[PDB]
Design a protein around this ligand. Structure first.
Ligand SMILES: *[C@@H]1O[C@H](CO)[C@@H](O[C@@H]2O[C@H](CO)[C@@H](O)[C@H](O)[C@H]2NC(C)=O)[C@H](O)[C@H]1NC(C)=O
Ligand code: NAG
Ligand code: NAG
Ligand code: NAG
Ligand code: NAG
Ligand code: NAG
Ligand code: NAG
Ligand code: NAG
Lengths: 49, 50, 281
């Protein structure tokens, strides 16, 4: 939905309210997102460790 | 060719507007200290103009 | 109709323990303590108490309490009732057809929202009727405004069916709202919880969720409240047509700029808060 980045996508267990699209952590970085087509929650994890 | 006068704008107001607000009132505006009570006259003006 | 047969009693006051917290944005958060600055209802603030009791055994102590109140930077509204007496509000400045105004009301079938130039009456009430030959309740009168012109915004919802029986007992439902007006948007937050109290505002904590943002763009300074009343074979006369009116109460507070600390649960629900300006602790 216009948000760009790089990472690894994985199925998530957290459940969003109907008026929420993505979430942030303490560092204000995006760590979860809802897929526009299949309404499911995915997590984002960095690639370099 | 004769002139189009359908579009209007406001000329006098007591205070400035806040963002994204609208007013469509047509009360008479008073400039002098004499009260108006309607009846446009010497110091009473119709707020809208064309 | 100007509803005669009324007494005159002094107002009543109360406070709000930890009521009035709402979600500040639309972002999901989990296991975090977050600090925000916005318009909030201060803790343990001063709340005015209004009620509508019409006991017929007291020879006229019936009272209705629908006055005009100011609108200073947003209000907090709560209602405790069991017979669906509260119906809506009107917002405006002069309320005399020289300026625009907002109307929200429920008429037992569907809710309507209008930003139109209205000529409001002095006592804008609704009414319900009770028949004896059969056991049923129906609405009969809708006396809110005289005229409507220059009418900009409109919204009517899908129909439903509503119950109008005058239940006896204790209060069952608690309804809370927050109203705000910034940059031409009218913002509403709401939350409904069930209770079993009798005569006071419950103390506790509850977080309010966003409902709608209306693009109305008007000057708002004052507001009233809309109430419904019952009529039956009680010596009619319209202005004093034995109008017994159920039992209900509601509360009003005022918002102010403050700084708060919010606690987000695991599941992104707000469960506690701290008011930074209440006391040094
Ligand atoms: C409650 O209000 C609604 C909204 O005005 C009423 O529904 C409208 O009724 C008029 C008159 O019959 C119709 O012309 C409109 O088309 C209706 N609105 C819609 C969206 O269809 C309704 O009748 C009112 N109910 C009561 C009991 O007063
Ligand atoms: C809003 O209403 C008040 C009360 O009538 C008025 O004094 C004020 O100027 C209005 N706001 C604007 C931007 O005109
Ligand atoms: C109710 O009182 C107001 C007071 O100004 C008056 O103008 C009005 O005529 C009275 N009743 C009605 C609905 O006529
Ligand atoms: C708020 O009201 C409760 C209920 O009586 C009371 O116990 C408490 O002391 C009040 N708090 C303040 C700050 O007035
Ligand atoms: C605040 O509440 C107290 C408690 O009864 C009351 O005496 C006082 O009048 C209230 N403040 C105002 C401005 O009414
Ligand atoms: C009940 O009776 C009233 C008049 O007494 C009538 O208007 C209403 O339609 C009736 N309701 C029914 C039969 O459900
Ligand atoms: C407002 O109403 C008056 C009379 O009803 C009319 O002359 C005027 O054009 C209207 N203005 C708008 C913007 O609808
Ligand atoms: C979140 O919801 C689940 C059920 O979906 C529940 O088991 C869990 O305890 C909740 N966590 C809370 C209340 O923080």
């Amino acid at each position: 939905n216009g948000l760009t980045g790089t990472g690894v996508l994985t199925e998530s267990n957290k459940k969003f309210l109907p008026f929420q699209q993505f979430g942030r952590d303490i560092a204000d970085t995006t760590d979860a997102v809802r897929d526009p087509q299949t309404l499911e929650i995915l997590d984002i994890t960095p690639c370099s460790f | 060719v004769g002139g189009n006068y359908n579009y209007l704008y406001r000329l006098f107001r007591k205070s400035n507007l806040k963002p994204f607000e609208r007013d469509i009132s047509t009360e008479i505006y008073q400039a002098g200290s004499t009260p108006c009570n309607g009846v446009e006259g010497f110091n009473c003006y119709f707020p809208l103009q064309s | 109709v100007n509803l005669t047969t009324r007494t005159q009693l002094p107002p009543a006051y109360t406070n709000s323990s930890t009521r009035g917290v709402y979600y500040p944005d639309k972002v999901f958060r989990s296991s975090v303590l977050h600090l925000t600055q916005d318009l909030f209802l201060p803790f343990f603030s001063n709340v005015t108490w209004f009620h509508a009791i019409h006991v017929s055994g007291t020879n006229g102590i019936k009272r209705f309490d629908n006055p005009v109140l100011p609108f200073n930077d947003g209000v907090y509204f709560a209602s405790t009732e069991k017979s669906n007496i509260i119906r809506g509000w009107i917002f405006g400045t002069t309320l005399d057809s020289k300026t625009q105004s907002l109307l929200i009301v429920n008429n037992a079938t569907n809710v309507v929202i209008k930003v139109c130039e209205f000529q409001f009456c002095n006592d804008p009430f609704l009414g319900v009727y009770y028949h004896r030959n059969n056991k049923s309740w129906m609405e009969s009168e809708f006396r809110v405004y005289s005229s409507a012109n220059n009418c900009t915004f409109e919204y009517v919802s899908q129909p439903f069916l509503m119950d109008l029986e005058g239940k006896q007992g204790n209060f069952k439902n608690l309804r809370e709202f927050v109203f705000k007006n910034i940059d031409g948007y009218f913002k509403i937050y709401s939350k409904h919880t069930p209770i079993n109290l009798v005569r006071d505002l419950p103390p506790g904590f509850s977080a309010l969720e966003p409902l709608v943002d209306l693009p109305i763009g008007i000057n708002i300074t004052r507001f009233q409240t809309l109430l419904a009343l019952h009529r039956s074979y009680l010596t009619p006369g319209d202005s004093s047509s034995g109008w017994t009116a159920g039992a209900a109460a509601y509360y009003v507070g005022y918002l102010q700029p403050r700084t708060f600390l919010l606690k987000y649960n695991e599941n992104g629900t707000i469960t506690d808060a701290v008011d930074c300006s209440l006391d040094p602790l």
